[PDB]
Structure formats: C-alpha cells, structure tokens
Amino acid sequence: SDLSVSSAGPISQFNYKQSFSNPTCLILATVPHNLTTITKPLKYSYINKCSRLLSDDRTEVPQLVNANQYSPCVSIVPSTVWEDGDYYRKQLSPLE
Amino acid sequence: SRKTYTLTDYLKNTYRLKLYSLRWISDHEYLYKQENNILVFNAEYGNSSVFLENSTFDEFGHSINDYSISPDGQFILLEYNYVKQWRHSYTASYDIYDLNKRQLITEERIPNNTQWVTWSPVGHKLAYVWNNDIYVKIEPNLPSYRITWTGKEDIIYNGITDWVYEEEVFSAYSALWWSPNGTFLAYAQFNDTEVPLIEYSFYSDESLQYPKTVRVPYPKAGAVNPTVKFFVVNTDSLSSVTNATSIQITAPASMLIGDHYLCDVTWATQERISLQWLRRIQNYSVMDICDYDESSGRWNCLVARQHIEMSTTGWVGRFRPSEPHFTLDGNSFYKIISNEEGYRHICYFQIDKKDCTFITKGTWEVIGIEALTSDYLYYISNEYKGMPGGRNLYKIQLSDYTKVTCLSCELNPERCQYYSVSFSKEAKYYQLRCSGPGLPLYTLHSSVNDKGLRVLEDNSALDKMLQNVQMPSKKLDFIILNETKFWYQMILPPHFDKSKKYPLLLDVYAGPCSQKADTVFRLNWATYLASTENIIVASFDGRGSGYQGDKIMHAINRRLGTFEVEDQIEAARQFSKMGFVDNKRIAIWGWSYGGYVTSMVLGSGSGVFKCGIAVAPVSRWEYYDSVYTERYMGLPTPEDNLDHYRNSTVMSRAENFKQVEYLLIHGTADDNVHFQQSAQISKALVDVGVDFQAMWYTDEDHGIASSTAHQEIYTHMSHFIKQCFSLP
C-alpha cells in the first residue's frame, strides 16, 4: 500500500519518490529459491520521520525527498536500522 | 467524660469508616457489592437486582484476590495468586468465567505469572502482559495473539512500565491504552538497557538460607534514563496467519534532540490520538495529535496540530503536564493550564490553533476536569470561601462562561467541604463522595436537573460509636507572612483549655505541590495522640505547596531543602506565639519528603524543636530518582545546579543534631527511598559523635504497610513521643 504514485506515506515522503513527469513503473517481486545469488539483509528498514528543528528550538519542518534523490537524512540513518523505533540526531552548524 | 480514642483503637481499627464504591456500567446503571454479592442498581428509578451471587465462587478452590466484570457483563475475570512486585504492580494467576454458560473457561487460559490484564472498554476483548510482552484475546476462549516478541526481564518492557515511569510518570503498572471502542490498542515500550541497577538484600522467611539480592533498574538524579517508544496496533485485523503489525508513532522533533519522556496518552475519537511528551529538563513539553489514515493503515501527526507548553519559572504541570479532554468531534479540547497570574484554570483549545482561551479565572485553582458534555463542563476546584484546602463540584456552561453553578457547596455546608465525583457513562447521573469535615457522606444525583435522588451511605453507625468517645476537635485556619496567606491545621485534644500549655507535634510533608491543611475528616494516630495523650498535632503548608498558584508553588524551584524547611520552623514559632503551646515540648515528624524536612529541621540548629522522628527520609537528592528530583532541581552537574544539590543534604547538618533527640526509621526493602539514604544519615551522625535512636524494619517497603510492621512502627513512635514529652 505504501509504495504507490498515489501514496502519501513515509515512503514517497522520506524514502523514494519517482518522476511525475515521465512514464513510470513500480514492480514488487520475490526472489524464489531458484536463484540463490541475491542475499537477504537482517530486516527491511525504512525512514519514518525526517525533520529539521529550526534554531528557535520550537518549529519542526519535515524534509521531503525529491524525485530522483536521496533523503537528506541518509547522512544520519544507518544502512540497516537496529531496532524498530530508533531515532537519530545531528546538530547543524550555523551556516548549515 | 467517656473513654478516649486509643492507640489500640487506631491499630485494631475498632472505629471504621464505611464507604460506598460503585462502578458505572451504563448511562443509568452501576454495580455495588452489598453483602459480598454483586448487585446492579438502576438510578433512573430505584430498583436493584442480583448480578452475581456470593456463592458463585464457593467452588473455585482458590483465595480470590480480585475480580473484574467485562463492559458487556458477559464475562468475569478472576484474579488469584497475587504476589507483590512494587507499588501498583504484581504477578498473578487468572481464570475467566463465562456468565451465560455459567462455566469456567478451561481451554487457552491466561498464563500463570501474568503482569497485567485489561478488558477492552466495550466488548469482552482482553489485553494482558506476560514476560513483558503484550498478548490480545479477542474471544476469551481462543488462542491469544502475541503483539510483541521483544520483551526481556529488566530490559525491555512492552505494555507495562519500568520502575521510574510507574512511580513518577504514569502512577500505574499498565502502559496500555485502548481506543474508545477497543479497535486500537496503543502501547509503550520502555528500554532500561543502560539504566544502572539498585541492589539490596531481601531476607524473606526464616528458612531461606542465603538472602535474595533484589536488582531494580532505577535512575538516580543525573544517571542514564530509560528510553521510550510508542506503538498502536489494530486489534480488529489480527490473525494467526500473521504476526500483528504495530505502527510506531514517533515523538516530535523538539523531543528527539535529547533525553525525553512520554508523559500522557489520551484518545480523542475512535481514530484520533493525543500524545504528550516532556523534555528531561521538565521546562518544556509538546502535545502531538495523530489521525488514523484509513488507506495507508498508519498514523498521521500533522505539525501545527502540535501544541507547545513551556514554563518560565519551574516545571510544566503540577507533577506532569495535564491531560486534555476532547469534545466529541475531537477538533477542540479543554485542558488545565496555568495563567498569567500563575493560577491553574481551564483552557479551551482548537486542535489547529496555537492560542487557547481561558474559561475560568480567579485567585483559586481548578483541581480537575471531571466530565464534559456538549452543554456543560463539570470540574472540581477550591474557589468556595477562598479555602485552598476545600474541594467542590462546579459545572460551567459552554455557551456562557459566566453561567457557572455550584453543584455541592449548598448540599450540606457545615458537614461537607471536600467532594470528589464519579459520573455515569454520559454524565446522566453522578455520585458525590464527601470526605470531611464531618463524617464522609455518599449520595447520588441526576445531572439533568441536579436532583439528589438517594443517600448511599452516611456513617450513622460510626457516628453512634463516636458519640461515646472523647474525640479531638480540628481547627483549620491561616496566618499571614509577607502579605500572603499560609494555611495550617491543628488537631486539638478533648476539653481543650486555651489557657493551659500543650505539647505540640508538627506533622510534616512539605514536598512540592503538597497540602497537609485540608478539610478532610480522619481517624488516625494524630487522633490517638490528641484524644489520649493531650498533645496538639499540627500541619502547615508553607512555600512550594499546592493549589494556591505558582507564586507559592514554584517558590522552591531549583532549591529544595530551603524555603519549605524555613517555613516549617517559622510555623512552630508562630504556633508558640498563640500561647497554648509549651515551647519546651515541640516534636516534628514526617515520612519520605517529610522525613527529609524533619531531618533538615532537626539539623538546622534553630533550637525550636526538642525531638523528631524521620521515617524513610530522603537525605541527599543525588540518591533519589531522576524524574521526580530533576523536575525540581535540574541536573547535579556543575553546569546546572550541582551547588544547590550539595548544599542541601541532611548529613552536612550532623553536628547540629547534638541538640535534639532523633528517631530514624527505615524499611530494609524500600525500593523508593533506599535504605542507603538513612544508612548515610546514621553514618554521618556516628562520625560526629551524636547519639540517636534508630529502627530498621526487615523486608518492609516504603509503605511499611504490612499489618504487624505497621502496628509495631506506630507503637515504637508512640513510646518515643510519650518519653520525649515526659508524659505517663
């Protein structure tokens, strides 16, 4: 349900957004025992919140991923998330 | 000229207060336990008809610790084999009895050693916690669905609380929250992985050869805290084909940047939830409002539905931030908030508007929001006669905030000044509980026209008994320091001759937002001391006390063991000035924070007090827990408030004790205020050559509440008092 052009959950919000200006496809498949050369990771991960807190220490501003790009939070989210609710923080320099 | 209220009277419970506890099960029906049968009463008229005969479980073959009937009256849950854990918590065995089938359910039972069980709020669904994992039963007699696989003793807690959340945040063992119709089950997960263990001995029965070392994750001020994560599971789409999916709802960004807590969980509608989070520096909290998303299956929490709450002069809320009561559509909500004058009043919020509008004002405070209909909000406050120590039920018209009417002040003015209320399912009827100054009175009312259909219980039998004993009187009044009123109460012996000079015993607690001066009627050992030993027993609410606004309450911010100690001394002086107090005979005593204040007073050098008893005292704030302590003190690092931490300890006053008689009492198994604190007190006292009395209680907790231990501690304290006052 969460991987669709019409979807508006954390996947298109913070993970992977494809072009709306080109013809587009989305295939879900399973690797059956036949081929053996692809290997499983520990668990499926995805980002469920990616936000900025501005310097006023009050305002939260979600960071949406753009088509054909990576979430700005890639810099701080591990390749595989350790446990189901983990959270990450990186303080920003005044320029940043 | 009758007999007095004696210590034996107090301990053996010879004069007992009757209660009347009911349980509403609908808009006009409640359950009572008359003569050990459960009956259902119909408020609309008068009738009453047996719901469950006492004989039903003559055949159980188990001592039955507790029961709970499901919302639809179809099933009853039977709790036996209760084995205690902390305070609010335990382990037990459970059996479910089908009321239709009149049979015990024997297939697929709830496992032994279960930590907690709740019915859903409307069906007969079951959520229980066992080995720290959540399990849901939809139909009571089919396999439970396991919700979490992650629970682990003393490390991961799913759906139940760890020590500190239990004691200082939720005041419960449960950390489950059903949605109104039981569709969703929201739960918390606590992680104590990096939280330090407190360890202590448990000696148990005389036959246990090697004592048991009890280990509890417990964060002390500044130490590493537990972490929290929040989940919601849809219980209607559970299945045995598939592990349940718990959607995690993540805390706001302003919380994620540092240590935080989850401090409130309130459902708004069948599909709207509100979460309140609090920063570890309890200056700052945020409410998040999350809607369920029928398509994606997740939970959407729009920013700008968030609501920030800050305190510029202390902490948020009285103890935690206050909970919201939503309207029926869940687009607006009412919430107790402290206003510009620093008095706590009801605020009316829109879920998408930052600003809120106050619906009550005044130099008095709203105690709690009790019920909310479309037309009226029912709330309890201490407005009447400007007494912070009284309580009454008010209702305010939602279309005209000027139309506020008082449902209890005129009911019985000289007898009833302390009310609490229990409302029927749609605020159709309500029961009023009166706690003092006269004997407790329990009545029933309909809220349609506020008519008082019935007197549930009046304590006539008790009144009868008390006629034939010399009871003490109670005075409740105030004094004026720096153009401000500070209330006190006194328990005065029978035949109180204003001319003679009585010994005085200060009863102290004095902790932040406390209140020992109230209108409640009590039968306790202060009654014994007054009735039998002709000794005046007094309490006083000085700086940093409750229900009088933040000018008084926040007065002790960042600086415990200062103003409230000073003020308890000042009150003994002020009591002297009244001229019926023999100032060569003032004791002071207190348990917990009151033990801390007692100790601090005895070590003050004031020379006002002859002796004191300190039961389970805090001695040094770096010993107590993080949540409570840091609320009032911040961190004990030197970047923060370390100076006030170290300046404020009992042990550093050891020398001064040479001027006073001191009795120090502590249970060996107190998981709350550790024996450690007193061990440190007695150590400092030994180290400066001060003599004192002491008493340990083997295996008792913070309550010293077990029968034998309780009569023992009061007997011992009685002897110490009678001796210190050189009375027969």
Swiss-Prot record, chain A:
Glycosylation site list: 34
Function summary: Attaches the virion to the cell membrane by interacting with host receptor, initiating the infection. Interacts with host DPP4 to mediate virla entry.
This protein's name: Spike protein S1
The species this protein was found in: Middle East respiratory syndrome-related coronavirus (isolate United Kingdom/H123990006/2012) (MERS-CoV)
Upper taxonomic lineage: Viruses, Riboviria, Orthornavirae, Pisuviricota, Pisoniviricetes
Gene symbol of the encoding locus: S
Swiss-Prot record, chain B:
Tissue and organ distribution: Expressed specifically in lymphatic vessels but not in blood vessels in the skin, small intestine, esophagus, ovary, breast and prostate glands. Not detected in lymphatic vessels in the lung, kidney, uterus, liver and stomach (at protein level). Expressed in the poorly differentiated crypt cells of the small intestine as well as in the mature villous cells. Expressed at very low levels in the colon.
Membrane topology: Single-pass type II membrane protein
Catalytically driven reaction(s): Release of an N-terminal dipeptide, Xaa-Yaa-|-Zaa-, from a polypeptide, preferentially when Yaa is Pro, provided Zaa is neither Pro nor hydroxyproline
Residues at the catalytic site: 592 (charge relay system), 670 (charge relay system), 702 (charge relay system)
Induction remarks: Up-regulated by IL12/interleukin-12 on activated T-cells. IL12-activated cells expressed enhanced levels of DPP4 but not mRNAs. Down-regulated by TNF. Up-regulated in migratory endothelial cells and in the invasive endothelial cells in tumors. Induced by hypoxia.
GO BP terms: behavioral fear response; cell adhesion; endothelial cell migration; glucagon processing; locomotory exploration behavior; membrane fusion; negative regulation of extracellular matrix disassembly; negative regulation of neutrophil chemotaxis
Effect on the protein of changing residue 54 to A: Does not inhibit dipeptidyl peptidase activity, interaction with ADA and homodimer formation
Extracellular side: 1-728
Keywords: Aminopeptidase, Cell adhesion, Cell junction, Cell membrane, Cell projection, Disulfide bond, Glycoprotein, Host-virus interaction, Hydrolase, Membrane, Protease, Receptor, Secreted, Serine protease, Signal-anchor, Transmembrane, Transmembrane helix
Main EC class the enzyme belongs to: hydrolase
Effect caused by changing residue 482 to A: Does not inhibit dipeptidyl peptidase activity, interaction with ADA and homodimer formation
GO terms under cellular component: apical plasma membrane; cell surface; endocytic vesicle; extracellular exosome; extracellular region; focal adhesion; intercellular canaliculus; lamellipodium
One of the record's GO molecular function terms: aminopeptidase activity
Cross-referenced Pfam families: DPPIV_N, Peptidase_S9
PROSITE patterns (UniProt xref): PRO_ENDOPEP_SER
Protein localization: Cell membrane; Apical cell membrane; Cell projection, Invadopodium membrane; Cell projection, Lamellipodium membrane
Oligomer and partners: Monomer. Homodimer. Heterodimer with Seprase (FAP). Requires homodimerization for optimal dipeptidyl peptidase activity and T-cell costimulation. Found in a membrane raft complex, at least composed of BCL10, CARD11, DPP4 and IKBKB. Associates with collagen. Interacts with PTPRC; the interaction is enhanced in an interleukin-12-dependent manner in activated lymphocytes. Interacts (via extracellular domain) with ADA; does not inhibit its dipeptidyl peptidase activity. Interacts with CAV1 (via the N-terminus); the interaction is direct.
